[PDB]
């Protein structure tokens, strides 16, 4: 969720040199899932994330090929 | 008596009298022109030089008058001509729009209710956040269905995707606020265990610190009086004298290209037509200078918010301060001779291509 | 600009003239006040002496040039009526006045699709020339430079609209009284503002000429006395009254015993000297209270005397009667707000808008000559400013709600001073709130006090119908309120004397059985009253009572209070008692609209229109419930086959509209032939009531149950399938069957008659005749009903018009109506 | 019309309205509409032992006038004599 993303950003800020892989997933994924939409949290927090070069943004929860991930 | 208020801070009128438009409009224009003059002088430029360094100019509502005046300036010995033009336009707009729709007393029950529900002191303009224009217009339509034609409200400023201002009589906006209060969810309410589609909308609303319903039907009768006064005072803007493009606030088009009277169009934009900031700011640029009022709570920061991630830098040209996130500049950036003067914002598509 | 204000020279060889000039006049030309002095060199210690002769005349001539635009003439009678010039209210004048006094209400501001109103304070600018001319006459002589305004007030005339731009107003002024008090001469003036011939509002102003006056031959007074109420108990009181020459009854044989009298008099006196009247005259109407609490005139007071030391009429009335006060104070005052205000730095703008060009407010030299603390602010500006405060806060910025406003000018006020106004709600008068206020200057010195009369918000009264009674209904109010006590005691005494039971006993104890005994003459009379009751529709109610009956017994199971004949009068009495308590507290708005749900119409019509007295009201309510009891067929067990059911269409189906319910009921009462219909429409799509045979409610309840349980010319035919299915499934049960429920249908308890249904259409005209005997022709006042009463039959405000008369036909036909409608032209002329 | 004729007609219509009342249905929907919309009634005072018509008025308000009241800023009050005595009598608690 948004709060979880903020906590990830704080972790990445406390260690600006260590690489942190932010693995974002929406509630649409299999297994234990959340209630969150897959896009609105990213539209909300993409700028905050990118202000930290040590964070790598990974998108998941609903992909199966190159056509829908492109 | 501006100079007396400036030299004697005690003889200055109260805040409400300073906020009335016959005072406010000229003085906001004067503040903008003073910031422009300071920026030009500290850089060693004549106003014409500083203008030539610009690719274009525009203004949010009232600032459109200052922008056109700036676009005409050539030399320090003739800057007061454009200063007089701008200040006269603002003076007459303020006077005629105050005579068209003066403010009156609000029932104390309404103010008590607004204050109790953590809403602002009611005024002729209500800003709404986190809702789309479509949504806000549905609410405005339902509220207007009951009111008579002369008490109608309407969307005056489209400041962004989810940032709108509705202008109208203060009591009609209070009724609209009641309707909205019957359609909001508390900020504290946690909806983390509610599926996304079923969550209730959290959206803000507040009254702006203004004293006139700008860009509204209420002020239309002031248009002819303002245009007659500007003619009687020999104030006009000729496309041959504007040296940089000035963008219209209703359709973002170059005012020079327009065939009719430019002053008439500017007045119409300020008093009648709504402002679409994004349509007006669709120009291309790397830097935007904000000479307006309000410091970091003004037009520049709003524009930055609307244009984040596109590699555009906004500098608040009227305030010296340090920004922690450093996502927009302050007055120091304009004059810094070292590399710190040139700071570019991130363009994601290029940075992470 | 620099202008001459004082010129000093020798007018004569011995006369020093000090001409004082005023430059702010009504036409721009300076007006000078020549003050003359004698120079006597022989008196070295005091060579200068003022010329006192004609001094007041000179001062008044100056003030006449400044205030009155007419030829200077002091020779007119103070007893005459003063007539002012016609005043046309324009937007410019209202704007200037509101900006001069600082009134920011939106009613007085030009706005689209709305007419601009003028503030109540504009009455003074409209009628100043008429009011101030009252203190000029030669007989009322005084130094206008020592004049003090003591108070001012406005009083809207009931039923009059506020002033508004575009109105032509005429003003009229009369001197109410002029009395020589030891410390000066008080002059009381009353101004009347008229619009389109009708009067709009009245202005009162009290003026004070400070000085020593002894010309009592020029003085007169007029006071309207308090209303005095006297209750005539014994023949001794009648003898005392008849001994008074002034107690003159129109009908000398009028029976005053056990009557309440009110005296509404006025005293007009002239003075021979400070303590003795040269003439006293007291006069006014005497009226007697009627059983509907209405007063009608039955005689006059009149008294005339020469030299006297007092008024005997009012002395007697005070000693023997009670004073009726229209103002009633709340338990404790309710604080509204404490507000801050400021006097302007200059009095010139208010002077120029109001026309009050008195030099003491604008000229330093004139104010100094008047021994004033400075260039004082107009007291009228302060009154207007405080009234604007009150209008905004006490009336919530609704101009029209301010109907009365009075101010007392206690101390002077100077320009550029901060004022402190405290407003509070203290009492009520005739449905209006009493607002006291007090204004203190910075030294905490009171400078202005007064009262305001503000209307309450637009109010409606709705009276509950049957179904809410309980043991002890209204008994606490009966313990506390005197009006409630009077209402219940009059009803109880009447029931005890006529039918041999007390309604209060039933309300308090809820007996299961009540026997009435017919022993003795009184008992025989009560038996007669019982036997005379009929249900023409001519069955006799109480068919067992006859000339050999010694007693009768009302019976029930849980309590007689839940029996129609006793239930309706108790509810009516409780509601009337509550409303009379509200009336005694000055709490009922004069324009309030009212309605009543079922039995409520009667309480409401009695409470707000006083169409019938308490004794008449309970009889009609008692008879109404008695006819209901014998309006349905009952077996030996008193269990009829009729009932009522409460339906909630939104509960059987979210898309089932009242036209869908009306469809089912009409079809369920059509394909089956039984009597059933909707009797009450209470809440749209949430509450309805149907009445009919208890059997036909079960089929409806079941039919809706089928509609709810399932998802439900063809539609009419399909429903006929449903109606038949349930029709027989309940007809099998015995006649006194049992109604159960649906998910949305809940029968009522204790209801057996289908009232508010077409079933009781035969026994209506006889009931109409019964009412005509009890609601009298003269007791109906149409002002009390027109536009305010909303009948359950025709749910439209009561209007005596051809459209209304035609309307009643449409629902239910009526032979008298078609006569009125057809002959509506005869009645018009 | 002369006042006496008007009184006569008013009495006739009143007595007729009352006679026919127990036979006709109680049109309370239209009455509530009339005094809630055509009068803009700000105070509704219910005289009776229980808050029945007051609850009915509140339910009518919550179903037909939520938007109208808010748009016109009408802050209606519904009072029953049995429970809202303090507001009716203006005797606020100390
Ligand atoms: C069968 C299955 C098991 C999973 N187990 C785990 C797990 O043990 N821990 C975890 O963090 N996420 C787990 N996930 C979530 C995925 O690793 C990943 O976050 C995302 O939900 C995959 O989305 P997709 O199923 O739409 O591709 C699981 C998902 C599935 C379908």
* C552 and C480 in a common domain: no
Q: Which residues contact C441 (CB under 8 A, 6 or more apart)?
A: C411, C413, C417, C418, C419, C420, C447
Nearest to C579 by CA among C467, C667, C473, C462: C462
H or E element in which residue D15 lies: helix D3-19
Cα–Cα distance list, B106 to C347, C393, D36 (Å): 27, 10, 24
Backbone angles phi, psi at B330, to 5 degrees: -125, -175
Read off the DSSP letter of residue B11.
Answer: S
Strand partners, C419: C341
Option in B104, B107, B150 nearest C112 (CB): B150
Q: Is B194's CB within 8 Å of A35's CB?
A: yes
Residue C494 and residue C629 in one domain: yes
CA C96 to chain centroid: 34
CB C670 within 8 A of CB C715: no
Report whether C652 contacts C663 (CB < 8 A).
no
Query: Do C395 and C409 have their domain in common?
Result: yes
- Please indicate if any CB of chain C lies within 8 Å of the CB of B192: no
What resolution in angstrom units was achieved for this structure? 2.3
Q: What are phi and psi of C783, to 5 degrees?
A: -60, -30
Specify whether the CB–CB gap between B208 and B294 falls below 8 A.
Answer: no
**Structural domain count of chain D:** 1
Asked if residue C136 and residue C76 are part of one domain, the reply reads: yes
Map residue C419 onto helix, strand or coil. strand
Which of C683, C690, C692 best probes binding to D when mutated, by most D CB atoms within 10 angstroms? C683
User: In chain D, whose CA is at the least distance from the CA of B179?
Assistant: D70
The DSSP code for C107 is G
CA–CA min distance A41, chain B (Å): 11
SS3 C708: helix
**Does one domain contain both C441 and C486?**
no
Query: Torsions phi, psi of B98, nearest 5?
Result: -80, -35
| Pairing outcome for strands C789-790 and C593-596 | parallel
CATH number of the domain where residue C533 is located: 6.10.60.10
Choose among C624, C742, C758, C597: nearest CA to C681.
Answer: C597
Question: How many Å lie between the alpha carbon of A21 and the closest alpha carbon of chain B?
Answer: 15
Which of C618, C586, C584 lies closest to C483, judged by CA? C584
What's the gap in Å between the CA of C104 and the closest CA on chain B?
A: 5
Residue in this structure with the two tokens 């000479």, named with its chain if needed: B291
Which residues does ligand 1 sit against, CB inside 6 Å?
A: A 25, 29-31, 60-62
Asked if B149 has any chain C CB less than 8 Å from its own CB, the reply is yes
The residue in chain C having the minimum alpha-carbon distance to the alpha carbon of residue B147 is C113
**C332/D94 CB distance under 8 A:** yes
Kindly tell me the burial class for residue C84, based on how many C-beta atoms sit within 10 Å of its own C-beta (0-12, 13-18, 19 or more): buried
d(CA C570, CA C478): 13
Asked whether residue C207 falls in the same domain as residue C347, the answer is yes
C-beta separation of C303 from C281 below 8 A: yes
Q: Which two tokens stand for residue B88?
A: 């006269």
Q: What is the CATH number of the domain that holds C186?
A: 3.10.129.10
Cα separation, C347 vs C361, in Å, equals 6
Closest listed residue to residue B178, CA positions, set D67, D60, D61: D67
Q: Are C596 and C624 in contact (CB under 8 A)?
A: no
CA distances from C398 to B108, C388, C395, C405 (A): 11, 11, 6, 15
Phi, psi of C197 (to 5 degrees): 90, -35
C790 with D34: Cβ contact below 8 A:
yes
How is the beta sheet containing C745-747 ordered, strand by strand? C745-747, C642-647, C687-693, C676-683, D26-27
CATH number at residue D69: 3.90.25.70
Contact C397 B148 (CB under 8 A): no
> Closest Cα to residue C338, out of C443, C420, C406, C449?
C420
Contact B70, B47 (CB under 8 A): yes
CA distance C570 to C578: 12
Enumerate residues 6+ apart whose C-beta is below 8 A from C666: none
CA of B353 to the centre of ligand 1 (A): 28
What span, in angstroms and rounded, lies between the C-alpha atoms of C454 and C394? 7
Q: Are residues C254 and C175 in the same domain?
A: no
Sorted by sequence, the CB contacts under 8 Å of residue C40 that are 6+ apart come out as C14, C47, C48, C49
Report the C-alpha gap between D66 and D53 in whole angstroms. 19
Q: Which helix (H) or strand (E) holds D65?
A: none
Which ranges of chain B would DSSP assign to H, the alpha helix?
2-7, 15-19, 21-42, 47-52, 63-72, 79-100, 108-116, 133-146, 170-181, 222-232, 262-271, 277-280, 299-306, 331-335, 348-351
Instruction: Copy the structure tokens of residue C527.
Output: 């038996």
Q: Report the first-to-last Cα separation within chain B, whole angstroms.
A: 58
Report how far residue C345's alpha carbon sits from residue C354's, in angstroms, rounded to the nearest whole number.
17
The yes-or-no reply on D/C contact (3 CB pairs or more, < 8 Å) is yes
Sequential DSSP letters for C128-170: HHHHHGGG-SSSS---GGGEEEEEEEEEEPTTPPPPBTT-EEE
> Closest by alpha carbon to C267, among C312, C230, C307, C327?
C312
Query: Which 3 state secondary structure label does DSSP give C247?
Result: strand
Domain span at D28 = 1-93
Structure tokens at B293: 């009022």
Cα C450–chain centre separation: 21
Distances (CA, A) of C432 to B39, C402, C588, C785: 64, 9, 8, 20
Contact A47 B309 (CB under 8 A): yes
The full set of domains in chain B, from first to last, is 1-103+212-344 (3.40.366.10), 104-211 (3.30.70.3320)
Look at residue B208 and give its three-state secondary structure.
coil
- Using CA atoms, how far residue C132 sits from A33, B13, C156, C187, in Å, is 88, 38, 20, 10
Find, in chain B, the residue whose alpha carbon is nearest to that of D70: B175
Question: DSSP states of C114-126 as a string?
Answer: SPPBPPTTHHHHH
CB C567 within 8 A of CB C625: yes
Domain that holds residue C607: 457-511+560-633+751-791
Rounded-to-integer distance, Cα C566 and Cα C474, Å: 15
Which residues touch B265 (CB under 8 Å, ≥6 apart)?
Answer: B248, B255, B258
Q: Are residues C593 and C480 in the same domain?
A: yes
- Interface touch A40/B308, C-beta < 8 Å: no
**Statement to judge: residues C492 and C550 lie in one domain:** no
Q: Whose CA is nearest to atom 4 of ligand 1?
A: A31
Q: Tokens 């104890």 correspond to what residue?
A: C509
Half-sphere exposure of A56 (CA within 13 A, CB side): 6
A57 three-state secondary structure: strand
Closest by Cα among C568, C701, C696, C671 to C629:
C568
Pick the closest to residue C290 from C260, C267, C310 (CA basis).
C260
CA of A48 to the centre of ligand 1 (A): 26
Q: What are the C-alpha distances in Å from C233 to residues C239, C258, C259, C503, C556?
A: 11, 5, 7, 26, 42
**Strands C227-232 and C266-271, how do they pair?**
unpaired
Structure letter (DSSP) for residue C590: T
CB C729 within 8 A of CB C626: no
Identify the CA nearest to C285 among candidates C265, C258, C314: C265
Closest-CA residue of A relative to B349 is: A50
Residue nearest ligand 1's atom 7 by CA: A31
> Which residue's entry shows tokens 């007089």?
B84
Would you give the DSSP letter of residue B273?
S
Write out C446-460 in H/E/C secondary structure: EEEEEEEEEECCCEE
DSSP per position, C479-525: HH-HHHHHHHHHHHHHHHHHHS--HHHHHHH--SEEEEE--HHHHHH
Q: Cβ–Cβ of D73/B142 closer than 8 Å?
A: no
Tell me the two tokens of residue C828.
């018009």
Active-site annotation holder among B61, B123, B172, B216: B61
Tokens 């009445």 -> residue: C691
Continuous segment of H or E residues that includes residue D57: helix D52-64
Residues C671 and C722 in one domain: yes
Same domain, C662 and C597: no
Residues of B in contact with D70 (CB under 8 A): 143, 175, 178-179, 182
Radius of gyration of chain B (CA): 21
Burial label, C73 (beta-carbon count in 10 A; 0-12, 13-18, 19+): exposed
- Report the residue of D33, D35, D55 to disrupt the C interface, i.e. the one with the largest count of C CBs within 10 Å: D35
Report the C-alpha gap between B293 and B317 in whole angstroms: 10
Tokens standing for residue A12: 């990445």
Are C745 and C647 within 8 A, CB to CB? Answer: yes
Q: Are B168 and B177 in contact (CB under 8 A)?
A: no
Q: Do B318 and B332 contact (CB within 8 A), yes or no?
A: no
**For ligand 1, atom 5, which residue shows the shortest CA distance?**
A31
What are the DSSP calls for B78-101, one per residue? GHHHHHHHHHHHHHHHHHHHHHHS
For residue B74, give the H/E element and its range.
Answer: none
CB C226 within 8 A of CB C325: yes
B-A interface (Cβ pairs under 8 Å ≥ 3): yes
Separation of CA C389 from chain center: 24
Question: What are the tokens at C52?
Answer: 């006192």
Q: What is the 3-state secondary structure (H, E, C) of C16-76?
A: EEEEEEECCCCCCCCEEEEEEEEECCCCCCCCEEECCCCHHHHHHHHHHHHHCCCCCCCCC
Go through A1-25 and write b for each residue having 16 or more CB atoms within 10 A of its CB, e for each that does not. eeeebeebbeebeeeeeeebebebb
Taking the CA of residue A37 and the nearest CA in chain B, the distance in Å comes to 6
CB contact at 8 A, C708 and C653: yes
Contact call for C and A: 3+ CB–CB distances under 8 Å: no
Q: Are strands C327-342 and C87-88 parallel, antiparallel or unpaired?
A: unpaired
Q: How far apart are CA C504 and CA D49, in angstroms?
A: 16
Angle between helices B170-181 and B133-146 (to 10 degrees): 120
B169 to chain C: closest CA residue: C111
CATH number of the domain where residue C708 is located: 3.30.70.3330
Q: Give the separation between CA C403 and CA C398, rounded to whole angstroms.
A: 11
State how far Cα C303 lies from the chain centre.
Answer: 32
Q: Is C106 helix (H, G, I), strand (E, B) or coil?
A: helix
Please answer whether residues D28 and C682 qualify as being in contact, where contact means their C-beta atoms are separated by less than 8 angstroms: yes
Say whether C397 is catalytic: no
Residue that the structure tokens 């007018």 belong to: C11
Name the DSSP class of B122.
P
* Residue C38 near residue C48 (C-beta atoms within 8 A): yes
Shortest CA gap B268–chain C (Å):
20
Contact, C758 vs C692, CB < 8 A?
no
CA distance B238 to C675: 86
In chain C, which among 323-352 make CB contacts under 8 A with chain B? 337
Residues D11, D39: contact at Cβ < 8 Å?
A: no
3-state helix, strand, coil in chain C (%, to 5): 35, 30, 35
Q: Report yes or no: B148 at the C interface, CB cutoff 8 Å.
A: yes
Dihedral of the alpha carbons of C472, C473, C475, C478, in degrees to the nearest 10:
-160
Mutate which: D70, D72, D74, D77, vs B, most B CBs within 10 A: D70
d(CA C570, CA C576): 10
Contacts of C291 (CB under 8 A, 6+ apart): C613, C614, C615, C616
Question: How far apart, in whole angstroms, are the C-alpha atoms of residue C314 and residue A16?
Answer: 100
Q: What is the bridge-based pairing of β-strands B125-129 and B163-167? A: antiparallel
Closest CA relative to residue C630, chosen from C523, C773, C755: C755
User: Taking a C-beta distance cutoff of 8 angstroms, is the pair B27, B93 a contact?
Assistant: no
Tokens of C347: 């009095």
Q: Which of A30, A35, A38 for mutating ligand 1's site (highest number of atoms within 8 Å of CB)?
A: A30
If asked whether residues C73 and C119 sit together in one domain, one would say: yes
* SS3 per residue for C344-408: CCCCHHHHHHHCCCCHHHCCHHHHHHCCCCCCCCCHHHHHHHHHHHHHHHCCCCCHHHEEEEEEE
Question: One of C170, C382, C502, C598 is an active-site residue; which one?
Answer: C598
- Which approach determined this entry? cryo-EM
């Amino acid at each position: 969720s948004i709060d979880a993303i903020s906590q990830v950003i704080n972790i990445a800020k406390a260690h600006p040199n260590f690489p942190i892989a932010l693995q974002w997933t929406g509630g649409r994924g299999g297994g234990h899932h959340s209630f969150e939409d897959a896009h609105t949290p990213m539209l909300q927090m993409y700028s905050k994330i990118r202000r930290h070069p040590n964070i790598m943004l990974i998108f998941g929860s609903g992909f199966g090929s190159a056509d829908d991930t492109y | 008596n501006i100079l007396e208020w400036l030299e004697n801070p005690s003889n200055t009128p109260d805040k409400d009298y300073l906020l009335s438009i016959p005072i406010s409009c000229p003085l906001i224009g004067v503040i903008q022109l003073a910031h422009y003059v300071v920026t030009a002088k500290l850089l060693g430029f004549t106003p014409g030089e500083l203008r030539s360094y610009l690719k274009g100019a525009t203004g949010h509502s009232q600032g459109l008058v200052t922008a056109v005046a700036i676009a005409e300036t050539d030399s320090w010995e003739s800057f007061f001509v454009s200063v007089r033009k701008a200040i006269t336009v603002l003076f007459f707009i303020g006077v005629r729009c105050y005579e068209a729709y003066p403010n009156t007393s609000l029932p104390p029950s309404i103010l008590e209710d607004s204050l109790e529900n953590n809403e602002g002191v009611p005024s002729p303009m209500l800003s709404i956040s986190n809702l789309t224009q479509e949504q806000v217009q549905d609410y405005v339509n339902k509220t207007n269905s009951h009111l008579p034609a002369g008490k109608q409200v309407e969307i005056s400023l489209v400041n962004g995707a989810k940032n709108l201002v509705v202008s109208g009589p203060p009591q009609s906006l209070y009724g609209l606020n009641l309707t909205l209060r019957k359609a909001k969810a508390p900020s504290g309410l946690d909806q983390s265990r509610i599926p996304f589609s079923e969550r209730k909308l959290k959206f803000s609303n507040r009254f702006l610190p203004v004293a006139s319903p700008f860009h509204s039907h209420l002020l239309v009768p002031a248009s002819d009086l303002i245009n007659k006064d500007l003619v009687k005072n020999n104030v006009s803007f000729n496309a041959k004298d504007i040296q940089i493009p000035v963008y219209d606030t209703f359709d973002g088009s170059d005012l020079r290209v327009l065939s009719g009277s430019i002053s008439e169009r500017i007045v119409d934009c300020i008093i009648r037509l709504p402002v679409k900031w994004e349509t007006t700011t669709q120009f291309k640029a790397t830097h935007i200078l904000d000479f307006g009022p309000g410091g970091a709570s003004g037009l520049g920061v709003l524009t930055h918010r609307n244009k984040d991630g596109t590699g555009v830098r906004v500098i608040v040209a009227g305030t010296l301060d340090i920004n922690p996130d450093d996502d927009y500049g302050f007055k120091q950036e304009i004059f810094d001779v070292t590399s710190n003067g040139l700071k570019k914002n991130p363009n994601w598509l290029e940075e992470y291509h | 600009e620099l202008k001459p204000t004082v010129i000093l020279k020798l007018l004569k060889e011995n006369i020093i003239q000090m001409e004082m000039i005023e430059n702010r006049t009504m036409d721009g030309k300076p007006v000078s006040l020549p003050l003359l002095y004698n120079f006597n060199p022989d008196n070295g210690f005091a060579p200068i002496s003022e010329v006192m002769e004609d001094r007041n005349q000179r001062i008044k001539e100056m003030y006449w040039k400044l205030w009155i635009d007419e030829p200077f003439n002091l020779d007119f009678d103070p007893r005459d009526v003063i007539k002012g010039k016609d005043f046309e209210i324009t937007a410019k004048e209202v704007y200037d006045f509101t900006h001069a006094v600082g009134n920011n209400c939106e009613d007085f501001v030009s706005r689209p699709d709305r007419t601009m109103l003028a503030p109540m304070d504009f009455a003074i600018v409209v009628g100043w020339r008429a009011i101030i001319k009252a203190i000029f006459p030669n007989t009322v002589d005084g130094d206008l430079l020592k004049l003090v305004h003591l108070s001012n007030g406005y009083k809207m005339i009931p039923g009059a609209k506020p002033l508004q731009v575009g109105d032509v107003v005429s003003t009229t002024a009369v001197i109410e009284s002029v009395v020589n008090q030891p410390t000066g001469k008080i002059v009381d003036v009353v101004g009347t503002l008229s619009r389109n011939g009708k009067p709009v509002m009245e202005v009162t102003s009290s003026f004070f000429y400070r000085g020593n006056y002894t010309d009592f031959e020029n003085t007169f007074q007029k006071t309207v006395e308090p209303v005095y109420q006297m209750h005539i108990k014994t023949s001794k009181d009648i003898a005392v009254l008849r001994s008074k020459e002034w107690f003159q009854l129109d009908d000398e044989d009028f029976d005053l015993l056990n009557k309440t009298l009110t005296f509404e008099t006025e005293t007009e006196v002239t003075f021979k000297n400070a303590n003795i009247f040269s003439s006293v005259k007291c006069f006014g109407p005497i009226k007697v209270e009627l059983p509907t609490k209405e007063t009608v005139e039955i005689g006059i007071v009149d008294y005339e005397a020469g030299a006297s030391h007092g008024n005997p009429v009012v002395d007697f009335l005070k000693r023997n009667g009670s004073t009726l006060e229209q103002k009633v104070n709340l338990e404790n005052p309710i604080p509204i707000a404490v507000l801050d205000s400021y006097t302007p730095s200059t009095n010139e703008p208010y002077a120029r808008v109001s026309g009050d060009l008195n030099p003491i407010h604008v000229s330093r030299h004139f104010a100094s000559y008047a021994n004033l603390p400075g260039t004082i602010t107009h007291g009228m500006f302060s009154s207007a400013s405080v009234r604007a405060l009150i209008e905004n806060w006490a009336a919530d910025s609704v101009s029209s709600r301010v109907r009365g406003y009075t101010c007392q000018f206690v101390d002077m006020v100077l320009p550029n001073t901060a004022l402190k106004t405290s407003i509070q709600h203290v009492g009520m008068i005739n449905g209006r709130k009493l607002i006291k206020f007090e204004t203190r200057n910075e030294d905490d010195v009171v400078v202005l006090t007064g009262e305001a009369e503000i209307e309450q918000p637009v109010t409606t009264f709705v009276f509950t119908g049957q179904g809410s009674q309980e043991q002890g209904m209204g008994m606490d109010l009966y313990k506390t309120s005197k009006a409630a006590q009077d209402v219940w005691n009059r009803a109880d005494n009447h029931f005890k004397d006529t039918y041999g039971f007390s309604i209060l006993d039933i309300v308090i104890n809820n007996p299961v059985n009540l026997t009435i005994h017919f022993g003795g003459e009184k008992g025989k009379r009560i038996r007669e009253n019982y036997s005379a009751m009929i249900f023409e529709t001519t069955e006799k109610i109480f068919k067992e009572i006859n000339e050999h009956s010694t007693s009768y017994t009302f019976r029930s199971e849980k309590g007689l209070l839940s029996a129609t004949q006793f239930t309706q009068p108790a509810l009516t009495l409780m509601e009337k008692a509550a409303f009379e308590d509200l009336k005694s507290k000055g709490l009922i708005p004069a324009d309030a609209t009212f309605a009543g749900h079922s039995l409520g119409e009667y309480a409401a019509l009695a409470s707000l229109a006083d169409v019938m007295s308490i004794e008449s009201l309970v009889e009609v309510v008692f008879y109404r419930g008695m006819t209901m009891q014998v309006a349905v067929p009952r077996d030996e067990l008193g269990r009829s086959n009729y009932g009522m059911i409460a339906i909630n269409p939104g509960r059987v189906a979210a898309s089932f509209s009242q036209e869908a319910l009306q469809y089912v009921v009409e079809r369920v009462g059509k394909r089956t032939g039984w009597l059933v219909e909707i009797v009450n429409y209470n809440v749209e799509n949430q509450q309805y009531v149907a009445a009919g045979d208890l059997r036909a409610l079960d089929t409806v309840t079941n039919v809706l149950n089928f509609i709810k349980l399932q998802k439900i010319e063809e539609v009419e035919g399909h429903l006929f399938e449903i109606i038949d299915e349930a029709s027989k499934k309940s007809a099998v049960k015995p006649r006194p069957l049992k109604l159960e429920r649906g998910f949305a249908c809940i029968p009522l308890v204790g209801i057996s008659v289908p009232f508010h249904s077409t079933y009781l259409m035969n026994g209506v005209k006889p009931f109409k005749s019964f009412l005509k005997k009890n609601i009298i022709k003269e007791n109906v006042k149409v002002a009390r009903l027109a536009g305010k009463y909303i009948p359950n039959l025709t749910a439209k405000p009561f209007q005596v018009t051809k459209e209304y008369f035609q309307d009643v036909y449409d629902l239910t036909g009526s032979e008298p109506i078609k006569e009125i409608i057809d002959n509506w032209e005869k009645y018009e002329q | 019309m002369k006042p006496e004729v008007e009184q006569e007609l008013a009495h006739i219509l009143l007595t007729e309205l009352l006679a026919y009342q127990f036979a006709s249905p109680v049109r309370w929907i239209e009455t509530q509409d009339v005094f809630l919309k055509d009068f803009n009634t700000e105070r509704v005072v219910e005289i009776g032992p229980s808050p029945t018509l007051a609850g009915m008025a509140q339910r009518t308000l919550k179903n037909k006038y939520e938007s109208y009241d808010a748009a016109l800023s009408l802050h209606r009050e519904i009072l029953c004599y049995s429970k809202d005595a303090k507001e009716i009598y203006y005797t606020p608690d100390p």
